[PDB]
Amino acid sequence: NKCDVVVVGGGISGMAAAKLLHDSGLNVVVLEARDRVGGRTYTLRNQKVKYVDLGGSYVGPTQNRILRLAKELGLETYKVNEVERLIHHVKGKSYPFRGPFPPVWNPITYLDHNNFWRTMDDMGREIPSDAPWKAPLAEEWDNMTMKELLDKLCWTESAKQLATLFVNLCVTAETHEVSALWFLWYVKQCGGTTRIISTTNGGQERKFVGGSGQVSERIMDLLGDRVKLERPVIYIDQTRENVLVETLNHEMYEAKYVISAIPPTLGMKIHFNPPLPMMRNQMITRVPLGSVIKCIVYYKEPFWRKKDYCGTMIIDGEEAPVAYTLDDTKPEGNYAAIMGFILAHKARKLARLTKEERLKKLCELYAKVLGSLEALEPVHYEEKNWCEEQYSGGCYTTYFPPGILTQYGRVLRQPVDRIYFAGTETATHWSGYMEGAVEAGERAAREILHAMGKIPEDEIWQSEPESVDVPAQPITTTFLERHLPSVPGLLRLIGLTTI
Amino acid sequence: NKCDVVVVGGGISGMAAAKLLHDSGLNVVVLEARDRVGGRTYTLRNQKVKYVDLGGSYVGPTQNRILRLAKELGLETYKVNEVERLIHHVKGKSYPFRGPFPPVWNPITYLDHNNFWRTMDDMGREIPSDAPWKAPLAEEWDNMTMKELLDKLCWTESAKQLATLFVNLCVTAETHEVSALWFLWYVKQCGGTTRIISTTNGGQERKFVGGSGQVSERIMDLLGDRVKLERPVIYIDQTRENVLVETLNHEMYEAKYVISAIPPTLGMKIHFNPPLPMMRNQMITRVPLGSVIKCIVYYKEPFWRKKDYCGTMIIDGEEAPVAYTLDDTKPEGNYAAIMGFILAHKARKLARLTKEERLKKLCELYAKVLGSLEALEPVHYEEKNWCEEQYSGGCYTTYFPPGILTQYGRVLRQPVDRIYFAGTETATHWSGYMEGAVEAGERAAREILHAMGKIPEDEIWQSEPESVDVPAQPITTTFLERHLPSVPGLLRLI
Numbered sequence: 004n005k006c007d008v009v010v011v012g013g014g015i016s017g018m019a020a021a022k023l024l025h026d027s028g029l030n031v032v033v034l035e036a037r038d039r040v041g042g043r044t045y046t047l048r049n050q051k052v053k054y055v056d057l058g059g060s061y062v063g064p065t066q067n068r069i070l071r072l073a074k075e076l077g078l079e080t081y082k083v084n085e086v087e088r089l090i091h092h093v094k095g096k097s098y099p100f101r102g103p104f105p106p107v108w109n110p111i112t113y114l115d116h117n118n119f120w121r122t123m124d125d126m127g128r129e130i131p132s133d134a135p136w137k138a139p140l141a142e143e144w145d146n147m148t149m150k151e152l153l154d155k156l157c158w159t160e161s162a163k164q165l166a167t168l169f170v171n172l173c174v175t176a177e178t179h180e181v182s183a184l185w186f187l188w189y190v191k192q193c194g195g196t197t198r199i200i201s202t203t204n205g206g207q208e209r210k211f212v213g214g215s216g217q218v219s220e221r222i223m224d225l226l227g228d229r230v231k232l233e234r235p236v237i238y239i240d241q242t243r244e245n246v247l248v249e250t251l252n253h254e255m256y257e258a259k260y261v262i263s264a265i266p267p268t269l270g271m272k273i274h275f276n277p278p279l280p281m282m283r284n285q286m287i288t289r290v291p292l293g294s295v296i297k298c299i300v301y302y303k304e305p306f307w308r309k310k311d312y313c314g315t316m317i318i319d320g321e322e323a324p325v326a327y328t329l330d331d332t333k334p335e336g337n338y339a340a341i342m343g344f345i346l347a348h349k350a351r352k353l354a355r356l357t358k359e360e361r362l363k364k365l366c367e368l369y370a371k372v373l374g375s376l377e378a379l380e381p382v383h384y385e386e387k388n389w390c391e392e393q394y395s396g397g398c399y400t401t402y403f404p405p406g407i408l409t410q411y412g413r414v415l416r417q418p419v420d421r422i423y424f425a426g427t428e429t430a431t432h433w434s435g436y437m438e439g440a441v442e443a444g445e446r447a448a449r450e451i452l453h454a455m456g457k458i459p460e461d462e463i464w465q466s467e468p469e470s471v472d473v474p475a476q477p478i479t480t481t482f483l484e485r486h487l488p489s490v491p492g493l494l495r496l497i498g499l500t501t502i
Numbered sequence: 503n504k505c506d507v508v509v510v511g512g513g514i515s516g517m518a519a520a521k522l523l524h525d526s527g528l529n530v531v532v533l534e535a536r537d538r539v540g541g542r543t544y545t546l547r548n549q550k551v552k553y554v555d556l557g558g559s560y561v562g563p564t565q566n567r568i569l570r571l572a573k574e575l576g577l578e579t580y581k582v583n584e585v586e587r588l589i590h591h592v593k594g595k596s597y598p599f600r601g602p603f604p605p606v607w608n609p610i611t612y613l614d615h616n617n618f619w620r621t622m623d624d625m626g627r628e629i630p631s632d633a634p635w636k637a638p639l640a641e642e643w644d645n646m647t648m649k650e651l652l653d654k655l656c657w658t659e660s661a662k663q664l665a666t667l668f669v670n671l672c673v674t675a676e677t678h679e680v681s682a683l684w685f686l687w688y689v690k691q692c693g694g695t696t697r698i699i700s701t702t703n704g705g706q707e708r709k710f711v712g713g714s715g716q717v718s719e720r721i722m723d724l725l726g727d728r729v730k731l732e733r734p735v736i737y738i739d740q741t742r743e744n745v746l747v748e749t750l751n752h753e754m755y756e757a758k759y760v761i762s763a764i765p766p767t768l769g770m771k772i773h774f775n776p777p778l779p780m781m782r783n784q785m786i787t788r789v790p791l792g793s794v795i796k797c798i799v800y801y802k803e804p805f806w807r808k809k810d811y812c813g814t815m816i817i818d819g820e821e822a823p824v825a826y827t828l829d830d831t832k833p834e835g836n837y838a839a840i841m842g843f844i845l846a847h848k849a850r851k852l853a854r855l856t857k858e859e860r861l862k863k864l865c866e867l868y869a870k871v872l873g874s875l876e877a878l879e880p881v882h883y884e885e886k887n888w889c890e891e892q893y894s895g896g897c898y899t900t901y902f903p904p905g906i907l908t909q910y911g912r913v914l915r916q917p918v919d920r921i922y923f924a925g926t927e928t929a930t931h932w933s934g935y936m937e938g939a940v941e942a943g944e945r946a947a948r949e950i951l952h953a954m955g956k957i958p959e960d961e962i963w964q965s966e967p968e969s970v971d972v973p974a975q976p977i978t979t980t981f982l983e984r985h986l987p988s989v990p991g992l993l994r995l996i
């Protein structure tokens with residue numbers, strides 16, 4: 004029954020919020036809909052894999068909050084293998100390379116590629132992390148999809164192909180599905196194109212030893228019987244002195260305040276009294292989550308390394324089930340594995356097959372790209388399709404279709420009376436990651452503390468010291484990168500030097 | 503507790519379904535979330551207005567199922583006034599006209615306008631009503647907004663402004679919010695641009711004497727205590743022999759089958775065991791409804807008719823709270839009124855004001871468009887903002903953003919084990935309307951009858967005889983309309 008704060012949701016965000024409020028001497032209850040905590044992170048354990056993350060996994064420099072939290076819970080990171088060459092597979096052929104960027108040799112394609120990445124970043128500088136609807140060209144950019152934007156900017160098919168893959172991999176959605184404003188904000192608040200795409204010095208640098216599910220698992224240990232499992236919340240009543248929150252198994256909770264720490268759309272699954280205000284009522288019908296299946300194929304040895312390949316594959320094409328892969332072997336070097344993501348429309352299309360049919364298709368693909376018959380000989384396979392989760396709605400995260408971010412965006416983390424909103428979607432730095440879950444959980448926890456007069460307004464938003472274990476190298480550009488023209492800028496320069 | 507069929511939803515679709523099944527001798531329960539039936543229709547009654555529809559209202563030719571159902575229930579239609587001239591208000595000035603379509607005088611603007619409506623309709627001829635995702639260029643058209651489309655087709659700002667108003671008014675949504683495929687399907691299934699936009703011979707021809715809320719009210723009369731009010735459904739369990747359906751006030755219902763007769767997205771409000779399959783699980787988080795406030799201003803007399811105006815105004819521009827109006831006076835000639843819609847971003851924007859602030863804005867606009875100080879002097883005002891409704895999600899209906907109709911659209915009326923899907927959004931002819939509600943309610947009712955062996959497969963989808971009271975005149979084009987070039991076609995000819 005009665006407590007200080009009810010947290011709806013036992014994913015990283017809700018658990019971080021509860022822990023903070025608990026740590027502050029308040030009585031919290033976490034109500035988790037599933038028979039586990041973790042939400043979009045999930046470590047499966049078994050003899051064949053030891054452990055493996057089937058959802059949220061990677062951490063990297065600038066992700067200082069998740070790293071501080073995990074370290075406090077006794078967890079360690081190891082670095083994702085990137086010692087040997089990466090592979091860009093283009094028109095049925097593999098081009099090994101080194102560096103975070105695939106080489107381009109043809110100087111036109113080179114200028115177009117430079118300009119595109121450059122422009123993503125230029126455009127994002129104009130977008131406030133905390134209020135994207137405030138950018139000078141907010142409406143113009145929100146009225147376009149990423150598809151219209153890519154069409155306008157890429158004067159080569161090669162750059163349009165790679166840029167399309169980048170969007171697919173980043174937000175698990177098609178270019179034509181998502182707002183250009185929101186996708187530009189998304190990349191910008193992760194610290195930019197380079198930080199987001201990179202393994203070394205980027206978001207995929209590292210993974211927790213033992214899996215990321217331990218973050219939520221271990222907080223639940225600390226909270227004990229304050230975490231209630233298999234309590235899906237169905238009803239919130241704020242008409243009375245204390246807030247009433249009812250679960251599906253008929254239990255009633257009573258708090259001073261509530262943190263909603265679930266995806267914004269999953270708010271639909273709760274009936275509200277009084278009804279939500281108008282803009283929230285409509286916002287939650289407008290914010291879908293992407294589509295992905297995460298796939299891990301196991302082998303006897305990491306045989307790719309022998310050919311001087313780290314196991315990272317960037318795979319152009321419609322034919323390819325998977326556009327990107329990473330070595331998923333353990334830091335000890337056993338349980339050799341390749342991780343791959345089936346994204347967006349391919350998630351929807353290949354869901355129709357059986358587990359055995361998907362495995363075969365990956366192996367056959369990976370045998371082509373890597374040039375290795377050994378890829379046809381896996382020992383184990385695990386996969387999770389996040390599209391089927393009633394209590395996620397999809398993965399990695401929530402995306403905004405055109406016209407929504409500017410009409411409805413400010414509503415996302417606006418309190419409704421005594422409810423406050425956490426969840427990775429309400430973060431202003433690495434929103435959509437395990438990092439933004441933390442930021443938002445802890446932030447919404449401090450908003451409630453402020454409401455009670457325990458802390459000043461000053462202290463609701465709070466900066467994080469940099470990890471001494473995972474420090475960030477700065478993102479640098481060369482002079483040529485900054486000043487090489489685009490294609491149309493070269494064409495205009497050819498136009499001028501003549502007349 | 504126990505019955506043959508539980509219907510989730512007390513709107514026209516659910517009530518039509520329940521009444522069919524009831525009429526067939528099955529035991530039906532209708533579970534209604536609100537303290538009323540009707541859903542997106544609502545007739546408020548009072549001394550000042552007598553009656554007024556604050557939601558769904560208009561009926562016209564080719565809407566033969568709503569008309570058959572309401573006739574059986576004892577309801578009558580009257581014709582929406584369109585005796586005098588219409589007004590197109592362009593760049594701050596009112597141009598009166600007769601006939602469906604507002605006149606275009608510039609030769610080039612004429613050719614561009616012609617080509618645009620013509621092309622809407624050409625395009626839609628390639629879209630199956632029951633399977634839009636099957637159009638030969640399904641993906642191409644679904645991967646574009648209406649906005650990219652309009653920007654490609656309209657070589658004149660004038661045609662692009664009117665076209666934009668057209669989308670706004672049709673689907674309560676911005677051009678950039680909606681799929682091109684879905685919008686072209688939408689228009690196609692209402693029988694084309696002319697049928698949809700028209701008052702005489704179109705969908706705004708008629709309203710019900712006494713309000714359309716009587717359709718749902720009177721079916722609930724017939725069903726009596728089978729209709730359960732303030733029973734929001736929260737939970738559906740299909741793991742056991744009979745289907746279990748739980749309401750928010752803790753009551754449990756058990757049935758052989760279930761009809762879900764609610765907007766597709768509002769299925770989010772229900773927790774399912776087993777979980778929904780994957781494509782439905784994700785579909786219902788992708789399908790929003792538009793934004794509108796329906797506003798009705800009352801006056802002593804229908805003064806516009808003295809100036810030879812029917813009350814229909816087409817209003818270009820951003821400054822305008824309302825793009826379109828209709829005479830809302832009663833067939834008797836009293837309770838003079840003008841009805842307008844505040845649509846899409848303007849609904850979102852003007853919601854922030856008070857009721858009195860919105861009134862003043864409408865009165866001042868209408869005084870301008872009509873050229874009448876009498877507009878500034880109303881006796882009463884009523885309005886409804888459908889954005890605020892927890893159990894509609896908006897109005898008029900559900901729209902598809904780009905990429906959704908081709909990836910998810912087949913899932914809409916696919917049964918999930920013993921649940922069947924009704925509600926206007928699943929209709930194939932006038933989906934969006936009071937008409938599609940009936941078609942889909944009766945159809946999903948027939949699917950369950952088939953499931954039980956009471957009727958053959960043959961009889962699930964059923965054609966409707968034409969109203970003898972409201973017959974349709976055919977939609978005609980002239981030779982010039984069909985063969986006049988477009989702007990680029992004339993340029994290529996030059």
Ligand SMILES: *[C]C1=C([C])[C]=C2C(=[C]1)N([C][C]([O])[C]([O])[C]([O])[C]OP([O])(=O)OP([O])(=O)O[C][C]1O[C](N3[C]=NC4=C3N=[C]N=C4[N])[C]([O])[C]1[O])C1=NC(=O)[N]C(=O)C1=N2/[C]=[C]/[C]N([C])[C]([C])[C]C1=[C][C]=[C][C]=[C]1
Pocket residue numbers: 011012013014015016017034035036037039040041042043044057058059060061062169172173199200201206207234235236237264265266269272273295296297327344389394395397398399400425426427428435436437438440
């Ligand atoms: C799915 C996924 C995957 C597959 C992958 C990934 C991911 C995912 N991600 C994401 C994460 O994980 C997230 O963010 C998080 O986790 C979130 O959290 P939160 O906010 O807290 O949320 P959640 O989890 O969901 O929770 C919630 C909870 O609640 C509940 N509920 C519901 N409802 C309800 C409830 N309760 C009660 N009641 C009611 N009513 C549920 O159950 C839960 O529990 C990620 N992240 C990170 O960080 N990392 C990673 O790694 C990840 N992943 C991924 C990614 C990838 N990427 C980025 C890419 C590949 C990269 C690149 C890009 C570009 C180029 C190249 C590369």
Ligand SMILES: *[C]C1=C([C])[C]=C2C(=[C]1)N([C][C]([O])[C]([O])[C]([O])[C]OP([O])(=O)OP([O])(=O)O[C][C]1O[C](N3[C]=NC4=C3N=[C]N=C4[N])[C]([O])[C]1[O])C1=NC(=O)[N]C(=O)C1=N2/[C]=[C]/[C]N([C])[C]([C])[C]C1=[C][C]=[C][C]=[C]1
Pocket residue numbers: 510511512513514515516533534535536538539540541542543556557558559560561668671672698699700705706733734735736763764765768771772794795796826843888893894896897898899924925926927934935936937939
């Ligand atoms: C809102 C509105 C307005 C304002 C207007 C309009 C409309 C609307 N519309 C629509 C109609 O009405 C519809 O469609 C119908 O109604 C539908 O129905 P249904 O399907 O059945 O659905 P609903 O109603 O929603 O119901 C459902 C029910 O359910 C319930 N729930 C929920 N959830 C739940 C429940 N329960 C239990 N549980 C749970 N969970 C609810 O509550 C309900 O009751 C329309 N329509 C027609 O037909 N007509 C008309 O008039 C209308 N309106 C309008 C329109 C306009 N337009 C079209 C325009 C203006 C024309 C034009 C165009 C272009 C150019 C020119 C002109």
